[PDB]
Write a protein that binds this ligand. Structure first.
Ligand SMILES: *C(=O)[C@@H](NC(=O)Cc1cccs1)[C@@H]1NC(C(=O)O)=C(/C=C/c2ccc([N+](=O)[O-])cc2[N+](=O)[O-])CS1
Length: 492
């Protein structure tokens, strides 16, 4: 005669904004439609009109209901515009009930899909920040006490057992303005250079905040009809790649810290090749004998960096790379994030020392490389990575000594000004610094920070299988510094 079950009360799921309160993920009211089959079986004359008004086949609908005859409840349609749901309600069919419900909407859409992520039909995070802060955002579902009837008639509620608690607002470190800039210029380059996938990260070197993270290809999380698993891949967090020549600045920092190297010291790279048993280190352009250390970067000499590494040892280079976070957990707690590989030897071989010095044998994510570069721009100080707005900045760790870090910044500044600039990479108005890298078709890498005299932004551009990165960097950096009203530092 009487039965007491418990239908839960959906919590309003917390708003996600960028730095500036711009909505990135919003709980939209919608309407589900369910029905008591036992109620529906007393109204079989009504089913064809209900099927029709649900776009479901008359005889399939009937079958669906017949074979759920003894079951108390089923879902008709989830997530109609409340009016669409209201029209179905007008039909006033016995047994057809509604529940109001929240469905997430993503106003920035594809622009920031990998960072924000998306929910599943339960309104429960299943990628990105939506999944990473699902606690914070979800809030406590309330519960209803009510009275059963012979086939599912609700009579009343005994008491409000649980008031539903809303989830909490979440403001990201992303600046949707810089995010849009990066999204756009990255996508142009992919097309302009005939390339397959991309990534671009922008970090605030002072606060640890990720200002922008974008990837190509990307998807529209509002329209997930055809899945395309490659498009949803948040590469900046997930693709480990080998970083190549963009770790030569940390090799160099190890050298300048050893006590044995200053930038005007000389290495002989004649003839542009070097052997270790069967392994042969090749430079890309081999018309050099003596180079100074700024020159080994400007001429992108693998032989020169390996010769410095042999003198100082791989252990020193490994230690600098580990202190900046290469191949180390970032603590972001983002879903399926990859740690990467930093190889360790008790006795490093000459071949293994050479490859590590020039970026091979280790694998990193773009977030790690950006973070390492941010540690270089802030003068050797690593502020912890953050994907949420940082109003009170945590203390940073000194991982490279400031004189050495300041010295490395200058060499990188000379890398952009004398050669590695004039065709691409010079950021107009500000002194920029950075290092290019080429990873096998190949993968095009560029990492750097700006402005050179009070560094603010660190940036990584990763572009795969092109038919390169330095313009993407130069353009995105230019606009990013302007969006932040960073006064130019290239002055008379
Ligand atoms: C660091 O990664 C070094 N590269 C290698 O040792 C591995 C190589 C990949 C392909 C060739 S060698 C140095 N880094 C750089 C760099 O700083 O970008 C280069 C650049 C060489 C390069 C690559 C591709 C093309 N291209 O038009 O396709 C042209 C050049 N190039 O300018 O000669 C490699 S050495």
């Amino acid at each position: 005669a009487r039965s007491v079950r418990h239908i839960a009360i959906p919590a309003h799921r917390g708003l996600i904004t960028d730095r500036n309160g711009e909505p990135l993920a919003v709980s939209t009211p919608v309407t589900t439609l369910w029905a008591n089959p036992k109620e529906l079986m007393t109204a079989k004359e009504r089913w064809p009109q209900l099927a029709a008004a649900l776009g479901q086949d008359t005889k399939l609908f009937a079958d669906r209901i017949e074979q759920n005859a003894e079951r108390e409840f089923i879902y008709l349609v989830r997530g109609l515009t409340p009016e669409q749901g209201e029209g179905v309600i007008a039909l006033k069919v016995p047994g057809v009930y509604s529940i109001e419900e929240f469905r997430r909407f993503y106003p920035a859409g594809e622009v920031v899909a990998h960072a924000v992520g998306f929910t599943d039909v339960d309104d429960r995070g299943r990628e990105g920040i939506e999944l990473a802060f699902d606690e914070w955002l979800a809030g406590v579902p309330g519960k209803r006490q009510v009275l059963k009837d012979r086939r599912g008639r609700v009579i009343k509620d005994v008491q409000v057992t649980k008031n539903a608690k809303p989830g909490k607002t979440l403001a990201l470190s992303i600046d949707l303005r810089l995010q849009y800039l990066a999204h756009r210029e990255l996508r142009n380059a992919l097309l302009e250079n005939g390339a397959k996938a991309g990534s671009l990260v922008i970090m605030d070197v002072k606060t640890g905040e990720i200002l922008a993270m974008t990837n190509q290809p990307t998807y529209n999380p509002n329209n997930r009809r055809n899945l395309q698993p490659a498009a949803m891949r948040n590469r900046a967090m997930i693709d480990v790649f080998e970083p190549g020549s963009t770790v030569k600045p940390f090799s160099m920092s190890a050298a300048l810290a050893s006590g044995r190297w200053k930038p005007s010291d000389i290495v002989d790279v004649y003839p542009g090749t070097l052997q270790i048993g069967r392994y042969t280190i090749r430079d890309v352009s081999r018309n050099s004998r003596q180079l100074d250390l700024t020159g080994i970067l400007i001429k992108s000499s693998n032989v020169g960096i390996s010769k410095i590494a042999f003198d100082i040892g791989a252990e020193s280079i490994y230690s600098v790379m580990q202190q900046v976070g290469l191949g180390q957990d970032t603590g972001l707690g983002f879903p399926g994030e990859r740690v990467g590989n930093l190889p360790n030897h008790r006795k490093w071989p000459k071949a293994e020392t050479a490859t590590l010095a020039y970026g091979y044998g280790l694998s990193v994510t773009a977030i790690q490389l950006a973070h390492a570069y941010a540690a270089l721009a802030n003068d050797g100080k690593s502020v912890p990575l953050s994907m949420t707005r940082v109003d009170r900045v945590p203390d940073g760790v000194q991982v490279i000594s400031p004189e050495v870090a300041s010295t490395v910044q200058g060499m990188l500044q000379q890398v952009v000004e004398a050669q590695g600039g004039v065709f691409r990479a010079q950021v107009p108005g500000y002194h920029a610094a950075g290092k290019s890298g080429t990873a096998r078709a190949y993968r095009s890498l560029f990492a750097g920070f700006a402005p050179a005299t009070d560094p603010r932004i660190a940036m990584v551009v990763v572009i795969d299988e092109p038919s390169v990165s330095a313009p993407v960097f130069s353009k995105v950096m230019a606009g990013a510094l302007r969006l932040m009203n960073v006064p130019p530092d290239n002055l008379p």
